Design a protein around this ligand. Structure first.
Ligand code: PLM
Length: 193
């Protein structure tokens, strides 16, 4: 799924606890042309266009999320695994109208477990930008209006081998809102060119 030979995403979620509520969730394949989502991130040029150019291309993914905004502590939990012992640097950049408004950098050392290495980045506090954005968003009286606002909101996650600075995974995230009857959903795509 979302991964390479060196590093795979095992689980991703963002949630609020007052039993808890997942806005989005991935627990653990088509293609999309990165071309069409440059405007959605900064031309840093450390932004998407620049990163996809250094490579490698098989490390790049796009995820479309249909978030459940129908519901505290706001948290993000991430888990990766690999067969090699590594220390990871995880960069998350929140962008609004192609401009970066948050960058969060975290480090996680491998933990030996059941014949492989796991990397657990759990219950990291969600940035306040997002908490405040979510409280506004859930106020909109129509889902079509939430989707219009979310057209301009994206996240770019870059996971690097800290000791070698090699890119392991780069994931672009885009968002719409789901209904309550249908839960959160996602679709994972390969980014190509
Ligand atoms: C409109 C739905 C979005 C709400 C859920 C956001 C899920 C992605 C959050 C992870 C990237 C941000 C960096 C980690 C902590 C943070 O939130 O600052």
């Amino acid at each position: 799924g979302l991964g390479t030979a060196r590093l795979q995403l095992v689980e991703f979620s963002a949630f609020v606890e007052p039993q808890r509520h997942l806005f989005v969730h991935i627990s653990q394949l088509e293609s999309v042309d990165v071309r069409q989502i440059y405007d959605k991130f900064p031309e840093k040029k450390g932004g998407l266009r620049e990163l996809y150019d250094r490579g490698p291309p098989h490390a790049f993914f796009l995820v479309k999320f249909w978030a459940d905004l129908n519901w505290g502590f706001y948290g993000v939990s991430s888990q990766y695994e690999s067969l090699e012992h590594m220390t990871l640097t995880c960069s998350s950049k929140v962008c609004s109208f192609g401009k970066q408004v948050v960058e969060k950098v975290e480090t996680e050392r491998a933990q030996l477990e059941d014949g492989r290495f796991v990397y657990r980045l759990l219950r990291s506090p969600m940035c306040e930008y997002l908490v405040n954005f979510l409280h506004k968003l859930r106020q909109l009286p129509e889902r079509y209006m939430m989707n219009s606002v979310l057209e301009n909101f994206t996240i770019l996650q870059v996971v690097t081998n800290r000791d070698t600075q090699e890119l392991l995974l780069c994931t672009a995230y885009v968002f719409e809102v789901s209904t309550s009857e249908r839960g959160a959903q996602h679709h994972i795509y390969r980014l190509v060119r």
